[PDB]
Fold:
Amino acid sequence: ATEKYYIRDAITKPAVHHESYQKLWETKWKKPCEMGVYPFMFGSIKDFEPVAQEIIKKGLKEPYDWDEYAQMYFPKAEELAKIAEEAEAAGEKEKASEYYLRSSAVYRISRFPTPRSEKQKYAWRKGCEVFYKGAALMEYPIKEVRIPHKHGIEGEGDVVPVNFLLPPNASETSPVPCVLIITGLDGYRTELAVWQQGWRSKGVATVIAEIPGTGDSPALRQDPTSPDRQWSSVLDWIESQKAVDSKKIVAWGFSTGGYYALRMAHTHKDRLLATISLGGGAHHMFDREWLEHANKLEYPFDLSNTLAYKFGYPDLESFIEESSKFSLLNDGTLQKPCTKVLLVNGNDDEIFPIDDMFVSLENGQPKLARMVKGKKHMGEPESFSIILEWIHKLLGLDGKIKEQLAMIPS
Structure:
């Protein structure tokens, strides 16, 4: 196991944040919260610090009671929503928008890593409600679209709920590129929404969709082909929006979403100008050895158990027994021709192995790659500059990526 992967014996070193919530907060989450970046986009340290202090006093830690855990966030979430409602009634739209999104952030963290209890499932519905109230009051409002899942089969949901933002003056006469953002294991369309205004400012439409077994994805969790059907429904809908240039659709997968971006470069080659996998996997992410170690590494909670739940399995062992069938190597995806693919990740990733970038480069057509040495999952911050520079060149945008990136921190 310690000899198998690029990061070698790093796989056997438990991360301190698994000891307690206090360690998660102090060593991992307080800093991104203060800076207003993932997983705290649209959030404020003023909102989370009081909640953190109360959770730390209770001494909460793995194994978490997700109902007990989620409830700690609700008083603050509700407080922010009431301030938003009062601002809206008073006509203070900018203030109303801010506090609805701050409320959505508190609900979001309450149901991290994924809704696995009734209060977390409640937090997902409440978070979406206040997110879309805040989004509606943005200068350039972001809309929910319930895309008909026309490619759905028996047991699948009837809609693919997405975020949609179309730049002003976009039309069938003057159509715009579209970045299709594919979200991750924990961050859903209410989180990656933080990218949409930046793209709008550069004359680019955005659609944000969740991967199977997360958010409101209608896809069968255990069926490796369920994403294929979902993207057929989503791309049919984008094609029907004549203000979008269907020859300029770029799919950007974040995290776990990277697997789906890489997969759809093959399954939907002729409908996508390019796909990007940022911190994605392909094959070794489904290994027993990888999954049996990743619960205790850089991921804030239990990565492997969360992954198992998202793939529709009642426990990790049941997932590991079957996980090989999701491999893009094993199922033959990587032998197929692909559209333009860009692979970016930190070499030292302890969520998905850099070894899967190698597997991706070992099969089918050549793919663009940037490895980020000495960085873990997503290879930030340089990964964002690499990807924006490449998309700006691909779509002939203004190339002003610093201006776009500056809009991300809340």
